Every structure is written in structure tokens, then in C-alpha cells.
Write a protein that binds this ligand. Sequence first.
Ligand SMILES: Cc1cc2nc3c(=O)[nH]c(=O)nc-3n(C[C@H](O)[C@H](O)[C@H](O)COP(=O)(O)OP(=O)(O)OC[C@H]3O[C@@H](n4cnc5c(N)ncnc54)[C@H](O)[C@@H]3O)c2cc1C
Ligand SMILES: Cc1cc2nc3c(=O)[nH]c(=O)nc-3n(C[C@H](O)[C@H](O)[C@H](O)COP(=O)(O)OP(=O)(O)OC[C@H]3O[C@@H](n4cnc5c(N)ncnc54)[C@H](O)[C@@H]3O)c2cc1C
Ligand SMILES: NC(=O)c1ccc[n+]([C@@H]2O[C@H](COP(=O)([O-])OP(=O)(O)OC[C@H]3O[C@@H](n4cnc5c(N)ncnc54)[C@H](OP(=O)(O)O)[C@@H]3O)[C@@H](O)[C@H]2O)c1
Ligand SMILES: NC(=O)c1ccc[n+]([C@@H]2O[C@H](COP(=O)([O-])OP(=O)(O)OC[C@H]3O[C@@H](n4cnc5c(N)ncnc54)[C@H](OP(=O)(O)O)[C@@H]3O)[C@@H](O)[C@H]2O)c1
Lengths: 444, 440
Amino acid sequence: MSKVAIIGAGPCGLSILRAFEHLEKKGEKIPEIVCFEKQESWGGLWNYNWRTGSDQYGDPVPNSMYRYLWSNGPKECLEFADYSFDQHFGKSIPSFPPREVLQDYILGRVSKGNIKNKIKFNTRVINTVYRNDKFEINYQDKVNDKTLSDTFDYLVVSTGHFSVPFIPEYEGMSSFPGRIMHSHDFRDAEEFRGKNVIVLGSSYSAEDVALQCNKYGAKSVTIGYRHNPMGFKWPKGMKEVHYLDKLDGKKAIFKDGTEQDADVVILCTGYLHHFPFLDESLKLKTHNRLYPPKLYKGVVWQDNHKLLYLGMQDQFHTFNMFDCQAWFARDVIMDKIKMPSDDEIDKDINKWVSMEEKLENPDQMIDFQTEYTKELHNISDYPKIDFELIRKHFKEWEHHKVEDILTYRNKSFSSPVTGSVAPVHHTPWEKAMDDSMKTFLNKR
Amino acid sequence: SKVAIIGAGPCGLSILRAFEHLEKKGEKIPEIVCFEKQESWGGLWNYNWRTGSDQYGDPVPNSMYRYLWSNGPKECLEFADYSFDQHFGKSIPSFPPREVLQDYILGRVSKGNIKNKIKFNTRVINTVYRNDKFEINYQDKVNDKTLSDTFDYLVVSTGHFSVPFIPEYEGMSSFPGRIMHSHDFRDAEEFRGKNVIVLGSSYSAEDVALQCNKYGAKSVTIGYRHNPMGFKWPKGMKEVHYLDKLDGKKAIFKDGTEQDADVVILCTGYLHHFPFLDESLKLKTHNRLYPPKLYKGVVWQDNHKLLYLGMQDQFHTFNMFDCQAWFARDVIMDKIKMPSDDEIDKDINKWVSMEEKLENPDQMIDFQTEYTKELHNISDYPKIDFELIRKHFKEWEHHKVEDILTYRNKSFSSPVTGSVAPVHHTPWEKAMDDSMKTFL
Ligand SMILES: Cc1cc2nc3c(=O)[nH]c(=O)nc-3n(C[C@H](O)[C@H](O)[C@H](O)COP(=O)(O)OP(=O)(O)OC[C@H]3O[C@@H](n4cnc5c(N)ncnc54)[C@H](O)[C@@H]3O)c2cc1C
Ligand SMILES: Cc1cc2nc3c(=O)[nH]c(=O)nc-3n(C[C@H](O)[C@H](O)[C@H](O)COP(=O)(O)OP(=O)(O)OC[C@H]3O[C@@H](n4cnc5c(N)ncnc54)[C@H](O)[C@@H]3O)c2cc1C
Ligand SMILES: NC(=O)c1ccc[n+]([C@@H]2O[C@H](COP(=O)([O-])OP(=O)(O)OC[C@H]3O[C@@H](n4cnc5c(N)ncnc54)[C@H](OP(=O)(O)O)[C@@H]3O)[C@@H](O)[C@H]2O)c1
Ligand SMILES: NC(=O)c1ccc[n+]([C@@H]2O[C@H](COP(=O)([O-])OP(=O)(O)OC[C@H]3O[C@@H](n4cnc5c(N)ncnc54)[C@H](OP(=O)(O)O)[C@@H]3O)[C@@H](O)[C@H]2O)c1
């Protein structure tokens, strides 16, 4: 008889709506659920949006995906246990599909029944306090420019953590005569054809953005790193150098002495966990990491067990980890899973944080998130899926990237749900200029 | 008595300055706290390379770009209590680059204890009125912490040209180039050799188009929805009717025009945006010379201790903000008494009715002149010749129609000291370096 609020209708918010649907479909009564989504439509980061900065209502644009974006990990690692690739597509498809394809898969899982009607779109949650055993929530109806209010027994935060950019300042930016942007701003790589591009950062965004710039015709691409280089086998017109010292006109100067003509600087420097719409007492504060503290099983807010965060960990696993988290959260809301004592909660949190701090390389991290996810998987209803296969897949994928960063997307992996082997795509990724679902799925 | 001011741009600084005049004379003044989300005072007059949102996730309020020059005669915006002659110590041309006017603005408030009243990197986030106090929450950005305090009076001076209005046009989802708003514009060199599309029909469209051309754009094409600006555009520039869609690197207009396009710059205006005010306190309006619900254009009709500065559309700027500020100060000080609710409503209607009838720039200049002159006579802001200013604006509009490329080369006389501006050593079209250093 509870009333449940969900903030965000991306993969995480959809995971929990889906978790609740499984129960309703079996005949179980479920709580009233309201899901707030600031975008026009569901899909979260998987929606492409030309917009940058803030929208027509002055709401910051949560979209970070760009044109020509392809799955950066094996799709088999993110398959839904309750909704297989074979079921959705009706045939086996390659392991690294373009964004539109995976978006289609995400929305397909939830588009058959009553989930969509539970979501309020163009609606931005702006304020949350907890009082008298209820979450009092203010939200903006954007189209009408109006503040609305309601009260809930449980609150699920699924707003992701890759939308609000962290944007550091370097010397000389005030006088740089080119574009300075964050990866969050990146939209169509053709913008930089024939240009000298500087990329700053050492993770997935730096890696992929650098490659897209080169692929879509940049004159040069130079990656700066602060601590250690990615060390991948970069294409001809690409180099990796240490630490940007300053910009001096159309000239980037690095600490290792490198001087590079620069037309654009793309800061691929990460994002903030940003929750301006939550009271300070409810607000998770953390940098991007595999296991932030104060989250029992990485989900339940330690100080308020009716506040549940989804997807807030750094990610190797994605979709099916979100599912495992969501099924867990559903079961907490349903009172199927009972919270242990305060001391046992704190002890369990410390166990995972301590392991997390000790992680030293991707193999250890992959093992860590595997064990985290598998433990979640065993406490609830989420269907059979082979996390051991997934563990192996991730490690193979890391090896592929080291082997050849240009060709890792051409590899084939087997489904941890159905066993199906992905066919090799008709077009090598390094030559695949058209990112449409149509050309991917059609022959030739 | 305790007063909060939100924003330390020209308007917030105008009121801090108004209160300072009194304190300097020996009058006791209220405790004043001014919140500013930027690192430093100056408002829009600060250049910031950042776009979108900052390192703390706070939307960037800066909209000015590199190579920006004053777009109206500086003699129309001179401070009555701090002349250009006083500040610069010699006559200088009428259209200075941004840094020059920024230096003038901050110079007026630099000498005293005003700066110490301002909390920087501090963003007001919530405002409610209860028990006769404004309860205000603000984020200390650097520490990522929410702080709270209570005030008797609230002055909102956060401008209205920071949060962009950004309309969608068919084809944007697949356009192979940059789509941006003028609010994003930073350095025109970014577009050298590029086919630029500019959408809009006001000051941002006009100046951005010219900046792109001046800094080597291969072409510039301006789309208008209702009416063209009609200025005498430079050789490589044209003005066409209504963008229909983008189809690849192709901009297609309703009048059939097809134009090669590498970048689309939406110069489509800004929102009055106050997420940090309770719905009951929040001004809702489009850009216009006289929004309703603002007594003398300043006092919130439904709460006479909430005062908005600078929220009108602008011909006048600095010295109008001043007149509004001196007014607001005197209201806060209880020198000026509010009239009855009915006389307030009648007075607002009087000005709104006039504002709705304005038909052309001349009538608008006359309107804002009268609005400003009336404010001027209710307080003690010093002598300044608004009649001369009225004339200057009309002359400037004429200059723009005559030649949009040369209007900044014109000279105007100070309405404060009578000083005649010298013609700058370099014509605007050829003035590439916007540094105050090289200007002076
Ligand atoms: C550029 C990029 C590429 C990526 N590529 C891959 C990939 O190839 N493979 C992979 O497995 N993972 C990828 N990821 C990881 C990605 O985070 C997850 O796949 C997934 O999108 C996370 O889903 P989520 O629901 O947790 O957050 P999101 O997908 O960000 O969804 C959050 C939703 O909440 C909404 N929201 C936010 N604030 C509010 C508010 N105040 N009120 C109402 N609604 C709000 C947002 O509009 C958004 O729709 C990528 C991430 C990024 C940024
Ligand atoms: C691109 C551009 C060019 C212009 N050029 C000219 C010109 O040449 N001549 C001319 O006369 N006028 C010009 N103007 C008009 C301009 O509005 C005024 O000159 C003046 O800047 C207005 O000052 P203001 O204090 O009212 O607003 P602003 O200058 O915008 O100051 C508002 C301040 O409030 C702060 N703020 C906002 N929200 C918050 C919050 N929640 N908490 C704390 N602080 C906050 C902002 O950081 C900002 O510093 C221009 C405007 C623009 C946009
Ligand atoms: N499907 C795709 O192809 C694709 C493309 C983009 C993003 N993604 C996803 O988007 C999510 C986020 O990845 P991300 O790379 O953007 O974030 P991230 O993994 O959190 O990495 C942040 C990077 O910023 C660097 N950094 C921090 N401060 C810096 C500074 N002051 N100067 C320079 N560098 C700085 C960090 O390295 P240092 O501290 O050593 O400098 C780090 O490498 C991930 O899920 C990723 O998979 C996928
Ligand atoms: N010193 C300088 O050189 C400098 C440079 C830039 C800005 N400024 C200042 O910035 C402030 C704002 O000027 P502004 O021009 O940005 O704002 P503005 O005066 O409010 O004008 C907004 C423009 O947007 C247009 N518009 C609205 N909706 C549109 C749509 N859907 N598609 C296309 N156009 C649309 C409007 O024309 P339609 O409705 O007819 O389309 C209008 O011309 C002013 O104070 C100005 O002085 C000064």
C-alpha cells in the first residue's frame, strides 16, 4: 500500500519499473509508482540529443552521448537476463552495436505493458526532504513552468552520474582562440574535420573521443594524461603526451616539452555525482569509484533505509548489474528482504569498501564487480545469467583493447543468457562511418 | 535591518554603491550580504572561457565573447556619480572594448568596503518568505555545502541574459557541425573559413554575424522569422526568411534559400529564470521594456520587500540600474513609502499600457527615458542629462541604419561632464585586438 517515487527513466529507472512489472504480471499487488523524467522520453544517456548545456526551459542537458557512438564493451556483458538479445532481435547480431541498436533493446524490454504510463516526462525533480516518515518532493512541470508537490514512502534515485561534467581550468584558457569543451558537449565529430584536436584525460571518454576525432577526419589528435598514459596502440596521426602546462595561442604546451598546434581542447575529465534536488541529509557525496560508502549492498542509503540509489558505482558491468540492484531494491520496498542491524550494515559496507580500496588493476576490478553483482543476484528473483562467463568476457575484452584499440569492436562474444555466439559484423568498426541501426542490421 | 542582494553584476553593484553613498555621509545603513556565483564581481562584463556549467556543476552565467565591443554609445550608460573623465582622466572614444567598461564598472566600487560584503562562488538556491523574513538557502560551491540565513529585504539582481532560450529546428539531430546558442559564443576565430548560419533578429544576431565575418567566416547567413534587421550587411553576408530545416551541411529556408552550413548559432534570446525563488516571489515574463507586477519596475507587487533590478529589456543600462537602485535603497530605508495597493496597481497599468503601444525604436527610447527620468526624480542620484541621452540613442539608431559597420566609430558627448569623445585611432572593422591596453 506504499507510494514509491523514482527519479530518472534511464536504464536504472527502467530496471526497477521492470522489476515491479514482473511481480504485477504474476498477480502480485504492487505499490503505486511515480517516475519523474526531465527528458521528453525514456532512455537516459542512451538517447541522442543535439542539445548542449541547457534546454529550452533552462534545465541542464543530461545527455552525454555523441553521433557515431558504438558500444564500448561487449554487449553480451550487459544482456538482460529476463529479456535476451535473441528474444529482442530474433537472431544473433554482432557484439559491439551502435548506440541506436542498444537503445532499441533497452526500450523494447519495457514498451509492451503499462510502464510508460507511470512516467511523467519533461518533469524535473527539484527538492526532496524527509519528514514525518515521508519523502516530500517538489518537481517542476517544465512545459507549464510550474512547481508541483507530492509525498512518497520510498524514494529511488536513478539519475546516473555521467551527465554533470567536471571541468578543470588550465593556464591560457582565457586567451585560447579555439573551442574549449567537455566530452559532455561532444556531438558530431565532423565538426573537427581538418582541425588539430587536444584531448585531455585517461579513461573511456578520452579514448573514444580521440578515436572518433581521428576517424572523422581531424588533422591531428594529441592526448594529454596527468598520471599515466592509456598506452593503447594509437593510429598514425595520434599521440599521447604528459600533462598540459598551458595554452599559448593556437599552441598547447605540455610538461614533457611537447608543443602542439591546437584548434580545440576537449576535456574528457569525468563527471560529478550531483544531486541538487536532495536534502543534504539524503545526498550521496562521492567521486567515481566501484564502491562508494554509505550504501548498503551499494543501494540502500545507510542513514535512511527507504532511500535507494541505483547505478551510482563506476561501471564495468552495466545493465544486468542495474537489474540486480533494482530487483534487490524492489524486494526491500516490498519487505521481502529485511534490513539487518545497524552494526551489521556498517560492517558489511566496510567489508566491500576495504576490498574496493585494495583493487589494483582491471582484472581485480572486474573480479570485484562480478562478486558484488553475483551476491546481489543471489538475494533476489532475477533470472539465470552466467556471471562467470561475463567475468571472462571482460578480461578478454581488456586484452583485445591492449592488442589493438582499433579492432576490439570487431570481436565476437557468446551470450551469458542463451549461449548464442555473435557473428562478425559486415563492416569493421574502423571503417563503419554510418552508425544507423538500419545499416547495421541490414546486409551490406 | 538585514538585506540580501543576489548578483554582483552592474545592478547588484549599483545598489551596494547606493548604500555606500549614504554610509560615507555618516548615515547608518543596514547589514548587507551580496551573493555571487562567479569567482569575482562584474556580472556579464566578465569574460569566461567556460560554457554550459562550471567545475561545480553550476550553470555558467557569462554570455560575453572575445573581441566584444560596447554596442551602444558609452555616453548613454555613464554613471552620474562617477564620470568617465574621473575614471580615465582623459576623453576616450564612445565605443570601448569590453575590458574597458568592465574596468570602469569595478573602478566605481573598488575604493571602499563594498567588495568585503560579497560572498563569491556562492549560489543562492532557495528562497521562501515566512514570519516576515526571507529564508534563504545558498550553496557554498567550493565546500559543496548548503548554508542558510534570514533577511528582511531581498534584492534580486541576477540579470536576464544568462539562461538561453534554445529552439529546435528540423534536422538538428543529424546536422554534421556545431549547433550552439549565442550564450556559448567565445572566440570567433573558431569559425574562420566556415559557413555560419545565424538565427535571430536582435542585438546578438547582429553582432555575432558581424564578429564571424570580421574574423574570417567563409560566409554568414542570417535567418529571420518575422522581419529582417535590414542593415547594410558586408559583402559576404545575407539575410533570409525563416529556417525550414537542416539537411546535412545544408540550411534550407522558407524563401527557398539553400545555404552551405558548417555551424548554426541560435541568437534566439534568453529566459527570465529564477529557480531559487518560491513560486509566490518569482517574476515570470518575456523580454520587454516593462513587465507587470513591478511597481516602478522594481518592487514586487505582492511583496514590497522583494525588489528586482534590471529586469526590463534595455536601451538604457548602467544609469537606469542606478536610478532603480537608488529607488530600491530608499524603499529599504523607509524614505520612500509605498502608496496604496490600488494606487500601485493603477500606476503599473499606466506604464504597462504605454509599453504595449510602443511601435518603433524612437518610441521605445522615449518610453525608457521617461521611465528612468521619473525614477531619477524620486531619489538623490546625481545630475545627468537624460534629454541628451535620449537624443544620443536616436542618433545611434540612425548611425546603425546608415552603416552597421561604422556606427562604433562615432563620437558622443558626456551627459555628465559634456566631454566630447575622440574618434578612436582604429576603425572598428579593422580593430582586431580588443585589449584595453592597446585601445587606450
Ligand atoms: C557517453 C557515454 C557512453 C556510454 N557508453 C556505454 C556503453 O557503450 N556501454 C555501456 O554498458 N555503458 C555505457 N555508458 C554507461 C551508462 O552510464 C549506462 O549504460 C547507463 O546509461 C546508466 O543508466 P542510469 O539510468 O543509471 O543513468 P542515466 O542513463 O544517465 O539515466 C538518468 C536519467 O535520469 C534523468 N534525470 C536526471 N536528473 C533528473 C531530475 N532532477 N529529475 C528528473 N529526471 C532526472 C535523466 O534525464 C536521465 O534520463 C555510457 C555512459 C556515457 C556517459
Ligand atoms: C552578450 C551581451 C553583451 C552586452 N553588451 C552590452 C553593451 O555593450 N552595453 C550595454 O550597455 N549593455 C550590454 N549588455 C546588457 C547587460 O545586461 C548589462 O550591461 C549588464 O551586464 C546587466 O547587469 P545585471 O547586474 O542586471 O545582470 P548581470 O550582469 O547578468 O549580473 C547578474 C549576476 O548575478 C549572478 N547570479 C545569477 N544567479 C545567481 C545565484 N543564484 N546566486 C548568486 N549569484 C547569481 C551572476 O553570476 C551575475 O554575475 C549586454 C548583455 C549581453 C548578454
Ligand atoms: N560507448 C563509448 O564509446 C563511450 C564514450 C564516452 C564515455 N563512455 C562512458 O562514459 C563513462 C565515463 O567515462 P569517462 O572517461 O568520461 O569518465 P571517468 O572514467 O570517470 O574518467 C575521468 C578521467 O578524467 C581524468 N581527469 C580527472 N581530472 C582531470 C584533470 N584535471 N585534467 C585531466 N584529466 C583529468 C581522469 O584521469 P587522471 O586523474 O589521471 O587525469 C580520468 O581519466 C564511462 O562509463 C565510460 O564507459 C563510453
Ligand atoms: N555589446 C554587444 O555587441 C552585444 C552582443 C550580443 C548581445 N548584446 C546584448 O544581449 C542582450 C540580449 O540581446 P539578444 O539579441 O540576445 O536577445 P533579444 O533582444 O531578446 O532578442 C531575441 C531574438 O530571438 C529571436 N527569436 C526568438 N525565438 C526565435 C526562434 N524560435 N527562432 C529564431 N529566432 C528567434 C527574436 O526574433 P523573432 O521573434 O522575430 O524570431 C529576437 O530577435 C541585449 O542587451 C543586447 O544588447 C550585446
